[PDB]
Design a protein around this ligand. Structure first.
Ligand code: AJP
Ligand code: AJP
Ligand code: LMG
Ligand code: LMG
Ligand code: LHG
Ligand code: LHG
Ligand code: D12
Ligand code: D12
Ligand code: D12
Ligand code: D12
Lengths: 101, 35, 62, 91, 116, 166
């Protein structure tokens, strides 16, 4: 079923975008998490980063890199599930028989 | 690391036969070709 | 012309020649004679080089 | 003011000015153009020379003075010591 | 509340940076489209230097001729050099000034718009 | 207080300029899409080649530079404040360039196969270029350049780097 893979990949990309937004918002401490957009974002992103908070402590106890590590791990995981041939120029198999492909 | 992830990915009607003409029709439409 | 395309770009032999010897193909499940010369049938597959060039031209046109 | 001397730029400018002053002191000719350079290179009085020729005569006199100074003052002192085994590039 | 450095060393605001950014982008956009800036365009100068020099020379020569003397022409870049080799070297300054006519006046970017 | 707050000298300015040259190396690939228009900036295509060679001699050089600057320079409170501020500003500009690269990597194919991408590429250079130039204009001068959404975070991070494990 192509629809299943399509929907799964779309959901994974949306979750990756949410994690990237959380990483970006970690730079600003003035934002209030009680406001509707930030509250919804943190409600969505709480458990996945909460797992890594327990798994990985801060390096020196003063700086936090947990959202970045979660984003990188999820990026690698979703990269694992990319389509075999993404078309663009990939499905043309480059030019002729090639060392690369 | 690169090799481990590559091996896992390789571990997992063909593409060029049907998908090449399917994706082009679905995404890049033109009446001179698809009408 | 050929002199222009050779000038543009030929190939990058990082792993050596990218074109290899040809492999004849024979029909498995069923000719005007002319049995003097056996014609090459290596290109009858879809995964070959000629089909790749044709798909490249079709993609460029589309 | 020592405050001016404290800055690196002022020191560099003063060093450049001193080098220029020493060079002008040791290479600028006086009366040797007509005496030696002009007659030797053109065989004419400097006044009759074209403006671009007088500069050439002055440059020739200055170069002769520079070579004389570098031979009679620096090279004699540094060559009184003979060739001290003359280290050479090994590779 | 945060330190923000000593007050003796001058600080630049954010408004100046925003103005610089917007000004650069607007300059590029105005240069790209000559005819869209309220029906007008953006000009670097008012009068070309050659035009001003020609007008001034014309007026000066008229005044000198009317006064009863042979008019003189003032050259942009400088006068001649007393040399006896070649003609280009003798008039090098004026030729150097005149050889930059196209770059001095015309703009480097394309005058019209392509792809739109 | 014991923190040094004197003016920055020339070697720190040179170091900060060399540090600022990093995002230019990161985004130098898309200079042609901008240079095709307004050729007067064509020199910007040929200026970063030695820096491209030196910063890319090893795959993990940027992380080593970041760790050597954040801990070795920004943490120290005996270095003048302006030098640390400029080092952190350069690091943050590099981070912004990395963010731009990451958001480039996920462009849809529809935008990829349209001229819009070219425009995007041009902007990816131009904006970054402006920032660097601006910072450089306030790097050779021992002044503070303030940029929205960045400078306040840099000011906080400077004092968070201090009293680290103390
Ligand atoms: C065409 C040439 C090149 C330009 C130049 O010469 C003419 O201009 C000259 C003149 O401008 C000099 C400057 C004069 C002003 C000086 C200012 C001084 O600042 C020092 O510290 C304080 C300011 O921070 C006070 O000023 C103090 O009083 C001074 O000690 C600075 O340290 C050196 C200084 C800038 C000097 C540097 C060297 C110069 C620029 C000289 C420079 C070579
Ligand atoms: C030659 C140059 C100059 C010298 C220098 O660079 C090289 O040497 C470097 C090196 O010496 C660094 C020090 C190494 C030792 C570090 C010690 C560290 O103490 C920390 O104390 C915290 C206590 O909570 C940590 O615990 C945290 O929380 C969890 C508990 C840990 O787990 C987690 O990890 C962390 C953990 O117990 C320990 O990490 C301190 O916070 C920073 C520290 C002192 C570093 C400060 C900066 C340095 C001195 C650098 C210093 C600039
Ligand atoms: C008879 C004398 C004539 C000499 C004329 C000298 C012209 C030099 C004037 C100074 C110009 C400054 C550029 C020097 C930067 C060195 C970088 C370098 O070499 O890159 C050399 C590169 C060229 O790079 C070369 O390009 C080649 C192209 O085929 C190849 O790729 C080579 O591999 C590559 O090395 O050029 C540049 O990147 C030029 C950058 C210019 C940046 C603008 C400067 C902005 C500030 C200007 C302010 C004025 C500066 C003072 C000017 C007055 C000076 C008296
Ligand atoms: C324009 C784009 C928008 C501006 C974006 C500016 C870059 C944002 C940086 C994204 C966060 C980077 C990161 O992982 O920070 C993760 C954390 C963010 O650290 C936070 O920084 C804030 C800045 O004021 C405050 O200091 C917070 O206390 C601190 O938690 O960074 C580190 O732990 C140290 C900095 C490493 C760089
Ligand atoms: C030219 C390179 C010499 C630079 C260091 C000499 C100057 C010197 O050592 O002065 C010491 C230098 C600055 O010290 P102060 O500010 O006290 O010195 C001001 C006066 O000493 C000026 O002479 O401190 C450093 O270690 C900064 C240099 C970091 C390293 C700079 C690297 C430059 C980039 C790499 C090239
Ligand atoms: C229906 C509603 C659709 C309307 C969408 C409106 C969007 C307008 C955005 C601007 C379009 C301008 C139109 C415009 O400027 O060019 C847009 C154009 C991109 O091509 P497009 O696909 O937009 O247009 C090609 C057309 O054939 C199809 O639209 O740029 C290029 O060709 C390369 C330009 C590089 C230029 C580099 C320098 C750029 C300097 C200016 C930076 C401007 C941004 C400043 C930000 C402060
Ligand atoms: C990429 C755009 C980010 C915008 C969200 C951050 C805005 C912070 C405003 C803080 C006001 C106190
Ligand atoms: C400002 C640097 C140069 C100043 C000194 C000039 C040296 C030549 C003087 C000749 C006098 C006869
Ligand atoms: C920095 C923003 C880049 C563009 C993000 C939006 C992409 C445009 C298409 C969205 C709807 C398909
Ligand atoms: C409708 C297609 C997308 C329009 C906007 C694409 C270009 C955005 C440039 C932003 C650069 C940071």
């Amino acid at each position: 079923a192509r629809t299943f893979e399509r929907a799964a990949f779309g959901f994974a990309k949306m979750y990756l975008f949410c994690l990237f937004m959380r990483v970006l918002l970690s730079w600003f401490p003035s934002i209030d998490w009680n406001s509707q957009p930030w509250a919804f974002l943190r409600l969505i992103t709480e458990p996945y980063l909460q797992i890594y908070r327990g798994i990985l402590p801060p390096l020196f106890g003063q700086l936090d890199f947990t959202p970045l590590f979660g984003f990188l791990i999820l990026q690698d995981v979703v990269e694992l599930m990319s389509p075999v041939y993404t078309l663009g120029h990939a499905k043309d198999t480059s030019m002729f028989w090639t060392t690369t492909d | 690391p690169g090799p481990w992830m590559r091996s896992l990915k390789k571990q997992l009607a063909s593409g060029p036969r049907v998908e090449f003409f399917r994706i082009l029709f679905e995404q890049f439409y033109h009446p001179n070709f698809h009408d | 012309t050929l002199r222009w395309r050779k000038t543009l770009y030929v190939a990058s032999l990082r792993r050596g020649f990218r074109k290899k010897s040809r492999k004849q193909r024979i029909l498995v499940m069923p000719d005007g004679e002319n049995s003097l010369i056996t014609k090459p049938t290596h290109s009858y597959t879809v995964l070959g080089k000629r089909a790749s060039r044709y798909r490249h031209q079709i993609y460029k046109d589309v | 003011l020592s405050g001016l001397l404290g800055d690196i730029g002022v020191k560099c400018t003063l060093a450049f000015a001193g080098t220029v002053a020493a060079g002008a002191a040791i290479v600028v000719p006086s009366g040797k153009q007509v005496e030696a350079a002009s007659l030797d290179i053109y065989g004419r009085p400097p006044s009759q020379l074209l403006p671009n020729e007088r500069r050439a005569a002055e440059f020739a006199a200055g170069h002769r003075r520079w070579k004389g100074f570098v031979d009679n003052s620096i090279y004699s002192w540094t060559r009184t010591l003979p060739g001290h085994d003359n280290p050479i590039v090994n590779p | 509340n945060v330190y923000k450095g000593p007050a003796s060393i001058p600080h630049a605001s954010a408004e100046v940076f925003g103005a610089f950014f917007l000004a650069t982008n607007t300059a590029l956009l105005a240069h790209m489209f000559p005819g869209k800036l309220f029906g007008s365009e953006l000009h670097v100068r008012k009068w070309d230097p050659d035009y001003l020099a020609s007008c001034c020379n014309e007026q000066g020569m008229r005044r000198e001729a009317l006064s009863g003397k042979k008019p003189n022409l003032w050259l942009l870049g400088g006068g001649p050099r007393l040399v006896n080799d070649s003609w280009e070297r003798m008039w090098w300054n004026n030729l150097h000034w005149k050889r930059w006519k196209v770059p001095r006046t015309g703009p480097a970017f394309p005058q019209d718009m392509y792809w739109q | 207080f014991g923190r040094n707050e004197g003016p920055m000298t020339w070697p720190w300015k040179l170091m900060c300029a060399i540090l600022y040259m990093l995002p230019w190396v990161d985004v130098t690939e898309k200079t042609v899409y901008f240079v095709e228009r307004f050729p007067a900036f064509v020199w910007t295509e040929y200026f970063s080649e030695p820096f491209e060679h030196w910063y890319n001699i090893h795959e993990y050089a940027p992380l080593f530079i970041f760790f050597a600057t954040y801990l070795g320079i920004v943490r120290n409170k005996k270095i003048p404040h302006v030098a640390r501020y400029h080092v952190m500003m350069g690091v943050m500009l590099d981070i912004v360039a990395m963010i731009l690269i990451v958001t480039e990597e996920n462009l849809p194919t529809g935008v990829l196969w349209t001229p819009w991408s070219d425009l995007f590429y041009a902007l990816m250079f131009w904006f970054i270029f402006l920032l660097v130039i601006y910072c450089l204009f306030f790097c050779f001068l021992g002044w503070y350049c303030e940029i929205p959404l960045i400078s306040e975070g840099v000011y906080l991070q400077i004092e968070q780097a201090e009293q680290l494990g103390q």
